[PDB]
From Swiss-Prot:
Two-domain protein with the central portion of the sequence acting as a hinge or connector between the two. Residues 149-168 have a biased composition (Low complexity). Residues 149-169 are annotated as: Disordered. Coiled coil: none annotated. The chain holds residues 204 to 370 of 405 of the full protein. Controls the length of the flagellar hook. This is Flagellar hook-length control protein. It comes from Salmonella typhimurium (strain LT2 / SGSC1412 / ATCC 700720). Belongs to the FliK family. It comes from the Bacteria.
Amino acid sequence: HMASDDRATGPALTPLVVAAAATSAKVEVDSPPAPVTHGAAMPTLSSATAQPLPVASAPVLSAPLGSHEWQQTFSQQVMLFTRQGQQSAQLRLHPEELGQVHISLKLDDNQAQLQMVSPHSHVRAALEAALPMLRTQLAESGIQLGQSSISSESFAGQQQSSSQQQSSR
């Protein structure tokens, strides 16, 4: 019977802890200008006169990339194709690993679509550059090379962004 707990535990003090006031903004800024100088002179060399070197029709299209002879030969083969009446053909090309690219020139109205299946290589640079020249050769035969396409297997490049160049005089 009856009861008595009796308490006495009860904290009572003011907590306070704060101290922070400073800044930082010095050192590490600006950069030295890179020195540059131009000059050169370019060693000139007079073209020596001599008799033209004997040649012939090159077997398939295998010449150094950049040579005009390779481009001319590229056009030659197509001229022959259009003369025969064909349009699809194979050809030994470099890099040798290619073994045979598939040339498929399509013909509609008076415009030819040149499709070719080959990987991306420096070969395309000189080959593609020969396309504007080819249209000139074919144009003499009546036909006009309008469309052209190059794919290693299939063509896909859904990407177009070039929002730039905002200025005037």
